[PDB]
Amino acid sequence: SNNLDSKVGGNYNYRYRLFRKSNLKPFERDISTEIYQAGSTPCNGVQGF
Amino acid sequence: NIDGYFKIYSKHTPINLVRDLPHGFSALEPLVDLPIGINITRFQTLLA
Amino acid sequence: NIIRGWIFGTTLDSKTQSLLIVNNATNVVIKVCEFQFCNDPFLGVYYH
Numbered sequence A: 001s002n003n004l005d006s007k008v009g010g011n012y013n014y015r016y017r018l019f020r021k022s023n024l025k026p027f028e029r030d031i032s033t034e035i036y037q038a039g040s041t042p043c044n045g046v047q048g049f
Numbered sequence B: 001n002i003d004g005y006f007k008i009y010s011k012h013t014p015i016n017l018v019r020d021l022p023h024g025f026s027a028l029e030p031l032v033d034l035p036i037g038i039n040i041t042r043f044q045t046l047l048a
Numbered sequence C: 001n002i003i004r005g006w007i008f009g010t011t012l013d014s015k016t017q018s019l020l021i022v023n024n025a026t027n028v029v030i031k032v033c034e035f036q037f038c039n040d041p042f043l044g045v046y047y048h
């Protein structure tokens, strides 16, 4: 789809889930965008260490 | 729910029985399949 | 006709999607949304 959608300064419309708690089952879908906790802390608000 | 598809099967009785769920036999026919793709852990009823 | 439908989900608050099943005085409505459901969902009818 380069010839339909490649932008010169990158087509930053599109998005994917980079990290999730575990595997998703076949034909499931998860839209929930909440913060991942790589540090063991009960992380809350928009960011953290 | 299985592999992204939810399912409903349903039936009703001809009886006007006294008070409690009877030990007769009548199997449920399929009503509808639904492609909902959501993880369900709990459910709730709606009354009038 | 007091049973009108069901909610199915996991958070029930629009953190993630959930399924609404309802019958009203017109039709059965089936819907999946980011639903902020009530802490006590119901239908109500002013009888007579």
Ligand SMILES: *[C@@H]1O[C@H](CO)[C@@H](O[C@@H]2O[C@H](CO)[C@@H](O)[C@H](O)[C@H]2NC(C)=O)[C@H](O)[C@H]1NC(C)=O
Binding pocket: A021, A022, A023, A024, A025, A028, B039, B040, B041, C010
């Ligand atoms: C489906 O929903 C439930 C609850 O949101 C998830 O169950 C949790 O799984 C994690 C990881 O194994 C456990 O730490 C929790 O204790 C579980 N919670 C409950 C209520 O059982 C489940 O992982 C979700 N799965 C998908 C594919 O979305």
Ligand SMILES: *[C@@H]1O[C@H](CO)[C@@H](O[C@@H]2O[C@H](CO)[C@@H](O)[C@H](O)[C@H]2NC(C)=O)[C@H](O)[C@H]1NC(C)=O
Binding pocket: C024, C025, C026, C027, C029
């Ligand atoms: C039963 O629920 C449905 C769904 O909300 C109602 O359908 C609406 O009907 C009006 C009139 O045609 C439309 O303007 C709306 O757009 C419809 N809703 C939707 C989501 O499209 C129906 O009227 C309800 N009936 C009762 C008695 O509550």
